Structures are given as C-alpha cells and as structure tokens.
C-alpha cells in the first residue's frame, strides 16, 4: 500500500534508480525475489485466471478441500509469465498466485517469416516443449495468418505478443496445467537456439552488483 522496504541488494539498488531497464538484469541472469522490481520496470500488465480446481482430498474426517488457481500475466509486447498456487480460499489463492507469476516473467524473441520489413511478427525458428505426456510444437507462419491453436494455449500467445504461428500438440492435452507449462517452456527456449546471426563475439562486462557499492 505504501513505501516498501527492500530486503535484498537487487531491490535496494533498483529503488534508487541506478539501473536503467530490466533487460540488463536479464542479460546478467540474476534471480529476482521481490515482485516490486518487476512491476516497476514493467507497468501495464494484465492478468487472467483460467480456472480453479476443487479437490476432494483425504478422508477419515471427511475431506478438507483446498483450491488451486492458475493465472498468467503479460503485456502483449514481449513479456509473459505463469504461476500456480493453492490455498484454502479462492481470494487468498489468487493474490498469492499473481505474485508468483510476476516473479516468473521472461522475455520472448520474435522474428520474421520470410523477408524482413520491420516489426517482427512470428518466431525466429520452430521449437517445442514437454511437461509430462504432452508435447507442444510452434512453427513460424506468414503474415495474415492468425493464431491457430486451442483456446487455452492460444490465449497465452497474445500476452507474449506473437502475431503469426502454427501450433501442434500430442499426448493427453486435457490436463490444463501440464499443457500451459509445456507452452511456457517452449516459448522460453527461443533465446537458447544459436542462430547464424549471433556468432559474432560479444564483450564481457562487470555486473551491476559489482560496479558500485550499495546503500545501508
């Protein structure tokens, strides 16, 4: 509600504003642990809850039910994350789940199908992910083609900011949590594929943590 007290060095430094933008934090692959960093260098984030699962768990005293909520966030311009949390009430679960999602947010590479004419629109390469008896495959597509996918996996792509793609899925796709996690892993690994246009050597620099001393 009011001024937040940084508990980690990465948190105190950003509040001062010494670090320009999130991208460098990604460049140095640093762990984020406070959701105040993310929403400071990424405002205008929309969230949607897919569904809540009722689980008639355990017996001997009846069943003590817990509820599991799945939420995902994005800005439709290259940042997306997904988190899941369960609790004893839907309101408590949803709030805690959004926090977990904000922590998870990652960037997504976007490229061209054929020839480049500004404003990349699709994936650079084709890539796939697997999260247990379910695989999802995404391949590039030309302009004009919309997103071709099931409603669940389709919704994620707007939040990531992709315009053109073909999709394919195998295995038991009725497990919504497993399906969403596989798509998340697939879109994530696009920055791991070493394309021809990245062979050029880059120079190593010191991380922001080491450049300057912090404030008590």
């Amino acid at each position: 509600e009011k001024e937040w007290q940084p508990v980690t060095k990465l948190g105190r430094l950003v509040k001062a504003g010494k670090i320009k933008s999130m991208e460098e934090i990604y460049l140095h692959s640093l762990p984020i642990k406070e959701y105040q960093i993310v929403d400071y260098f990424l405002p205008k984030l929309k969230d949607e809850v897919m569904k809540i699962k009722p689980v008639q768990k355990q017996t001997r005293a009846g069943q003590r039910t817990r509820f599991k909520a799945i939420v995902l966030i994005g800005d439709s311009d290259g940042h997306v994350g997904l988190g899941i949390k369960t609790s004893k009430e839907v309101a408590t679960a949803i709030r805690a789940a959004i926090i977990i999602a904000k922590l998870s947010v990652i960037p997504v590479r976007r490229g061209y199908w054929g020839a480049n004419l500004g404003r990349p629109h699709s994936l650079p390469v084709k890539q796939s992910g697997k999260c247990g008896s379910v695989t999802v495959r995404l391949i590039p597509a030309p302009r004009g083609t919309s997103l071709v996918a099931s409603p669940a996996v389709k919704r994620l792509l707007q939040l990531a900011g992709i315009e053109d793609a073909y999709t394919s899925s195998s295995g038991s796709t009725k497990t919504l949590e497993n399906t969403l996690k596989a798509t998340f892993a697939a879109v994530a690994n696009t920055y791991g594929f070493l394309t021809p246009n990245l062979w050029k050597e880059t120079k190593l620099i010191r991380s922001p943590l080491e450049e300057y001393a912090d404030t008590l």
Binding site: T8, L209, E210
Partner: protein, 208 residues
C-alpha cells in the same frame, strides 16, 4: 610473460614450510578429475601431489579474493573442527564474514531466516563435507573456490587448490599463505620482499 612478472615464484624459503606440514601425502584413491594435479603415484601406496602446481593456483585464487570492492562480500566456510580456528583468524586479518560449525541450510535462499547473507564469492575447506554449502551456491550465480585433495567431487567448483585437506598442520598452513598473498596484492605488506610479522602456528587447533 604477458600478465605475470617474474617476481611470482615459489622461493626456496616457503618450500620447506609447506612440505613440512605433510601436504604431499593425501588420498590413496585417485579421482579422475584430479589426475592433472598429480606428479607420480608412489610405489605400492599413496599418491603424490605436485607442490609446484600449488603455488600458481594459490596466486590465482588470491587474484580472485582481491577483486571485490568491499571485502565484506566474501564468505569462508568450514565445518570440521580442524579448520575452524584458522578460518576465524582469516576473517580478522582481512575483511570477510566467516561460518564455522553448522551451516543452517536456507541461508542463501530464504530471506526470513536470521542467518541470511547474500555474498558474491565462497571459499570452502572441503567440498565433500560442505556439499550443502555448494549445493546452495548453485542457486544465486556465485562462483566457488575450495581446497581439495585428489579425491573430491568437483561439480560447481571453479578453482581448485590441491592440498592434504585432512591434516592437522596442512589446512592451517595453506590458509596462512593465502591470507598473506592477499595482503601482498593490497597495500598492507607494502612489498613482496619484506616478511610479515605473524608466524604460521597461530593458524592451528587447540584440543580442549
């Protein structure tokens, strides 16, 4: 050379002390990743470490230590009793935070435990018995330096110093030389030729 001058050499005087503390006798069972730091296997018994190799890796480890702006971002770990007093005196002569005894897993990952510190470097006395410390270093992007004999797992270990790692005199002497070399690079000793005014036996263990 192109980066190191010729003043960084073993020097005869140091050699007697290091090999007097029984540092060339350790670990009959030969691990395959420590074979490069091996001179020759003794006839019908133990292996023999290459004492020359120690000196260059020791200076290399020292270069890592004197790189952080504030010396408070350096943690020195030890669990077994033989290397506890020595670690504590290191933290006093230089600037560093020390941990002797139990580690309390969660120190580097949980932000509500009372023993919570976020360092940028870790120095370990034995990777086998401090595996828990290394396991957590793998979560927050922090390199690891450790003293190792020839039998020791080397996952997530970036710099390895070959020593006895289990002797009474050996672990103390190595810590002393490393601390001395750090002060040489700093403006403390003021010269590579002048001797330092504390003797190695301070870095020992007392039974009661």
């Amino acid at each position: 050379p192109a980066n190191l001058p010729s003043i960084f050499n073993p020097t005869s005087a140091d050699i007697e002390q290091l090999l007097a503390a029984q540092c060339h006798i350790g670990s009959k069972n030969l691990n395959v990743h420590m074979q490069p730091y091996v001179w020759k296997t003794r006839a019908d018994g133990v292996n023999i470490i290459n004492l020359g190799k120690t000196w260059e890796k020791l200076v290399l480890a020292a270069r890592i230590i004197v790189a952080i702006d504030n010396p408070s971002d350096v943690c020195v770990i030890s669990s077994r009793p033989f290397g506890q007093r020595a670690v504590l005196k290191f933290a006093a002569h230089t600037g560093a935070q020390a941990i002797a005894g139990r580690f309390t897993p969660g120190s580097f990952t949980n932000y509500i435990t009372r023993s919570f510190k976020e360092p940028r470097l870790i120095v370990v006395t034995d990777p086998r018995t401090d595996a828990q410390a290394i396991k957590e270093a793998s979560y927050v992007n922090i390199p690891v330096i450790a003293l190792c004999d020839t039998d020791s797992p080397l996952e997530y270990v970036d710099v390895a110093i070959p020593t006895n790692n289990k002797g009474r005199h050996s672990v103390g002497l190595i810590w002393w030389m490393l601390a001395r070399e750090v002060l040489r690079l700093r403006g403390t000793i003021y010269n590579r030729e002048t001797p330092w005014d504390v003797m190695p036996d301070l870095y020992f263990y007392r039974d009661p």
